[PDB]
Structures are given as C-alpha cells and as structure tokens.
Amino acid sequence: GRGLGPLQIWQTDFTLEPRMAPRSWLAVTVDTASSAIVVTQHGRVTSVAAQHHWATAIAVLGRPKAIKTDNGSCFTSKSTREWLARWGIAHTTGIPGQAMVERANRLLKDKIRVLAEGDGFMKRIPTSKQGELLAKAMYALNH
Template structure:
C-alpha cells in the first residue's frame, strides 16, 4: 500500500485549523483529521488515527513540510516499518492524487 498525505489550513475550524488528509492510492480510501499544529507530533497523531481504520501502508509520500521531515516523524515511521518518500519542493504534481 502507498499513501499520499498533505495538510490544508482551514481557518474556520479555529484552533484545529490544520486538516491532515491521507489517501490510499490503491483503494482510494481517505482519512482526514483536524489538529492544532503542523509539528511532527501532529503528523504522527494523524497517521495513528488512520492506521486504526485503514491498512498500515508500506510507503507514505509527502511534501517536504517541516512536520513530515522532522526527526520525530522519521523515528515514528521507522518504528512502524514504513518507508517515507518526499516530493520535489514546489512541485505538487509528484503528489497529484492528494493535491
């Protein structure tokens, strides 16, 4: 399984304005959750919630946002045995499905 993940800022949600969305590129299943920040811990909390409802992926593709390339996120993915691939900066076509 391969997932693509991205975050969207949605101000009307107030404190929980960061909406993380992951999509399983094979099944098309989507998982979304709202968080208060863009740090690695927020990314990991989102993925943990998604793991409870979707199949745990073999690979997750993201952009190069600070939450995705943080040390805590890297350790989290390593502990789960998930490969992480980042796209080319400022090139959203590498993640065409999630974008």
C-alpha cells in the first residue's frame, strides 16, 4: 500500500554509451519513488526499443502510474502512445523536469567506465562481457 508514500512516477531517457557498442543505446528508467534504476541496451533508438525497455522495467519495478520522458520521436510516436495506453500508464513530456534520469545517466556511464577499466577494458567492452557488466552497474547503483 502506498499510503502517503511517493507517487509511482518514472522518468525514462536514452543515453548513448559507445563502451557498450554495438548495442550502445542505453534505455534508462529511474523510479522517482525509490531512485531505483533499470537499464537495458539496444542497437537502435526506436519506439519498439523504448517499449521493450519498459516491458523489462515493469517486470522489475511494477506497473507505474505515469512515466515522464522528453519529446523524442521514440516516445511521442503513435506506436509508443498506443503501447502505454494498452498498459494503462499515463505519459507526460512536461511543460512545453527530469533531473533524476539525467543524474542516473551520468552515474551509470561513470560506473560503467569504472567497472570496465577495472576489468582492463579501456575502450569498448568486449561484446561477450557487456551484459554482466551492465547488470553489475545496475546492481551497484540500486543495492
């Protein structure tokens, strides 16, 4: 039960991280209630990538009441609008307001760099090592 606790509102963004190429587009959600982050990697910034990301974020965090994004085409497309309506999730792009996800993006890229360099990867992370490294970064920031 929420009671008087924080409203179930996420912020979501994409951030480009070449250390994670070829799937260098990181989709990042921050739960504004808890500050928990979910991150997934994607080859291309698309509407369907956003939807795949949120499907995973819902599995992890539960179904939010609302999601805040910017006005990027992957978020304002008919496809994305319909996907969010299917889920019953309200969507805002703010006042024509997401400092928390901007912070998450920076903390995540910094952590990825630190972990990668720790493993001796000074440039791109080998593809076979990326999934666990990304999960380690998410763990590091959440737990």
